């Protein structure tokens, strides 16, 4: 579970993210599509080109959802309830893909947070993204 120290690290790291969350969200998606091609199988209806407005828009929602998760870190399952429903019963993304995107979100944060991405914060952020992933796949079966 997320410790008081992990929650503190997450809030601080995402706090520094601030208004850039959406831009980082889209970058994480770009990183994912180029690094792990199989993830593109979930977006055949998207223009996945660099700079794509579709990826920027989707990135904005992913980032906003995490911002909302950070704001409800103590009560995360409920804050993400609607998204769990959606991924479990409509989108149906195989669980392994959440690990690919989480890794790309970490890489994105690392590339933008020279000061805050300390080993401890890296550890906390990885735990946080794993818990978000767990929550989002919790209604799968």
Partner 1 sequence: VHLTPEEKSAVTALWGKVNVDEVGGEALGRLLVVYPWTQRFFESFGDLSTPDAVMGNPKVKAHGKKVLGAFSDGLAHLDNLKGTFATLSELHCDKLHVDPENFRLLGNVLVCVLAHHFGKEFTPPVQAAYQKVVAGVANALAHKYH
How far apart are alpha carbons 45 and 61 in whole angstroms?
17
Task: Pick out residues in 65-124 that bind a second copy (CB under 8 A).
Answer: 123
Q: Which is nearer to a second copy, 39 or 124 (CB)?
A: 124
58 is in an annotated binding site: yes
Least separation in angstroms between residue 8's CB and ligand HEM is 20
**Is 87 one of the annotated binding-site residues?**
yes
The site for ligand HEM (CB under 6 A) is made up of 39, 42-43, 58, 61-62, 65-66, 83, 86-87, 91, 93, 97-98, 101-102, 132-133, 136
């Amino acid at each position: 579970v997320l410790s008081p120290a992990d929650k503190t690290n997450v809030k601080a790291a995402w706090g520094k993210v601030g208004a850039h969350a959406g831009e980082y969200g889209a970058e994480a998606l770009e990183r994912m599509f180029l690094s792990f091609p199989t993830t593109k199988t979930y977006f055949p209806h998207f223009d996945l080109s660099h700079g794509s407005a579709q990826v920027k828009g989707h990135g904005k929602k992913v980032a906003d959802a995490l911002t909302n998760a950070v704001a409800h870190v103590d009560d995360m399952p409920n804050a993400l309830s609607a998204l769990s429903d959606l991924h479990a019963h409509k989108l149906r993304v195989a669980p392994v893909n959440f690990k690919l995107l989480s890794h790309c979100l970490l890489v994105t944060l690392a590339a933008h947070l020279p000061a805050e991405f300390t080993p401890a914060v890296h550890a906390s952020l990885d735990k946080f993204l794993a818990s978000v992933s767990t929550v989002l796949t919790s209604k799968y079966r």
